[PDB]
Amino acid sequence: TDYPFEANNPYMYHENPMEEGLSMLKLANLAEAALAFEAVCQAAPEREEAWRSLGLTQAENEKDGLAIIALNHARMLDPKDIAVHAALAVSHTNEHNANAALASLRAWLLSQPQYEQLFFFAAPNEYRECRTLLHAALEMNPNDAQLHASLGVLYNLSNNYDSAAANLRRAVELRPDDAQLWNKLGATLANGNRPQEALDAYNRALDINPGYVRVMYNMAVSYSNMSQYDLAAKQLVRAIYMQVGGTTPASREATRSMWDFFRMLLNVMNRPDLVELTYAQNVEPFAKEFGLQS
């Protein structure tokens, strides 16, 4: 009752929405896969992996709010699920909840048998501790790609983007097919004012996962920072289209906020005619207008 389950869910009827959810993560994609996991969580609230998959899917679908709600259930149900802790650190970092982000990185580390034995204004000591534990882990294991991913998240939180991107760069050399890691390197680069480099990263991330809505929004953000509004427009049509798939009564607000960002770009680029048509909420005419479809 703390998670705003989607009312219009055909997956509630199904027999095996979890296996289906897991198929859709690769083959239909995130919005639909999330619905499937939503159905499993309603039915068997105690399935940690139902909550976990939902949370990671939601974050990938540009909804850290719901991700967090979801991952906190998984974290209560299995506190040694390191994937939930890593994801918690990412969503909180994105939502600027510093204390939680740092507690999720700590937990992520110390929940591993491998590493369990082990100034930043908002949380100087929480950060001191994290940086120390994580750097100690890195001399135990210099080539743990996920250790580098975590230093990357740590250093994002403290706006040390140079050091973050370095670690995330070592991370993608170890795991060059990890879309998650490419996005992280991408966001690090965008946020550190290296937007052309960011797009390179984001483009690797989309080649691995063409339904990765967070990456499409990120790309739009960077193209907008560089005032290339046509390119930005194109990525937000893809974003809006992909993030819905189905039909969505929290969710309205994610969709509308994205429509609003795109609409504002249409205003900025002098297309009053296209600005008005956003209110209708139909993406396809924009897909055609921005070279995406016939």
Binding site: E62, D64, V90, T93, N94, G152, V153, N156, N183, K184, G186, A187, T188, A190, N191, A198, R214, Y217, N218, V221, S222, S224, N225
Partner: peptide
């Protein structure tokens, strides 16, 4: 604007 990890 701010990018999301």
């Amino acid at each position: 604007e701010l990018a999301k990890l």
